[PDB]
Amino acid sequence: ASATARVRIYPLALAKVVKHAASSLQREVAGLLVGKSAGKVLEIWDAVTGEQYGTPLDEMVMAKVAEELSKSDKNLYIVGWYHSHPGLDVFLSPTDIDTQKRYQAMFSKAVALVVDPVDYAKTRRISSLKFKVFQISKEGRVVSLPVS
């Protein structure tokens, strides 16, 4: 359906995304996914961001993400992004589609992890996490990828 067949999100990455998203329920937070492909499987090993957590400048976002990237594993690379949409359920907005298309122009296997962390933050159970991982097909459809 799209360039990447499926995705494996390592627990430390998922933890980082969820902590960010769940710590910031008033905001549609974002960051980068760090990992590597292994054939048709895209591995998400880590996540970084230049955004603030919680209740809160491009110049600060750039510094912070550069600092995080400087500490990242040199055998890994940017494989996508995440975006939280508290209370909106899980889909790519029109804006998100544009962004994802831009990511894919940088790296054809890039993916978009969308999370709605409201229920997780209420229940404190990962099984209440609402998320999907998306890519955009050539013909412009939003495709939801298998995730382990």
Residue numbers in the entry: -3 to 52, 57 to 148
Which of the paper's sentences describe this entry?
The first complete archaeal Ub modifier system, including E2 and E3 enzymes, was discovered in 2011 in Candidatus Caldiarchaeum subterraneum. C. subterraneum Ub (CsUb), E1, E2, and E3 are organized in a single operon, adjacent to a second E3 protein and a JAMM protease (CsRpn11) with high sequence similarity to eukaryotic Rpn119.
To determine crystal structures for CsRpn11, we used the full-length wild-type form and a series of truncated proteins with deletions C-terminal of the JAMM core domain. However, while the latter is assembled in an antiparallel fashion, the CsRpn11 homodimer is parallel, with an interface formed by the first and the fourth alpha-helix, H1 and H4, of CsRpn11. In the truncated CsRpn11Δ149–202 structure, however, which is lacking H4, and which we solved on the basis of the full-length Rpn11 coordinates, this dimerization is not observed. At 45 °C, truncated CsRpn11 processed CsUb-pre with a KM of 24.2 µM and a kcat of 3.5 min−1, and bound the reaction product with a KD of 14.6 µM. With a KM of 31.6 µM and a kcat of 4.0 min−1, the full-length version displayed similar reaction parameters, indicating that the CsRpn11 C-terminal helices are indeed not critically required for catalysis.
